[PDB]
Write a protein that binds this ligand. Structure first.
Ligand SMILES: Nc1nnc(-c2ccccc2O)cc1N1CCC(O)CC1
Ligand SMILES: [Cl-]
Ligand SMILES: [Zn+2]
Ligand SMILES: [Zn+2]
Length: 115
């Protein structure tokens, strides 16, 4: 894939995450756009050694930093793992983190397998 072709795929994957809603209409990605304040949420940075958010992933797409879909996927996995480490299982944030992963990998398969 050329860098320009790869970028279009990565943009479509991120878009699928950012537009996803639950049956009640809530944008499940909203909380993950921007990392919490280091001033107001210092425990997050004591616990999470490699913080990442969707804004950072979007910038990496614009910068061409990802050389494969897999590289973006690993950053999505890290975002979700961080959220699932900081938040209790069955909490809304924990569930939404898993939902972001499920959306990403479903969309990746739809793109990569379609013929
Ligand atoms: N409980 C949270 N867990 N994760 C995050 C979080 C954000 C972006 C990327 C990854 C993440 O893991 C943000 C959280 N809260 C934001 C709102 C605040 O009021 C309380 C903290
Ligand atoms: Cl992958
Ligand atoms: Zn992979
Ligand atoms: Zn097709």
């Amino acid at each position: 894939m050329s860098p320009a072709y790869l970028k279009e795929i990565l943009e479509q994957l991120l878009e699928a995450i950012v537009v996803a809603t639950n049956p009640s209409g809530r944008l499940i990605s909203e909380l993950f756009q921007k990392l919490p304040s280091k001033v107001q949420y210092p425990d997050y940075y004591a616990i999470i050694k490699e913080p990442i958010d969707l804004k950072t992933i979007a910038q990496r797409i614009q910068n061409g930093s990802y050389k494969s879909i897999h590289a973006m996927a690993k950053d999505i996995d890290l975002l979700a793992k961080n959220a699932k480490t900081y938040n209790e299982p069955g909490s809304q944030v924990f569930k939404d983190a898993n939902s972001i992963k499920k959306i990403f990998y479903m969309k990746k398969a739809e793109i990569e397998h379609h013929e």
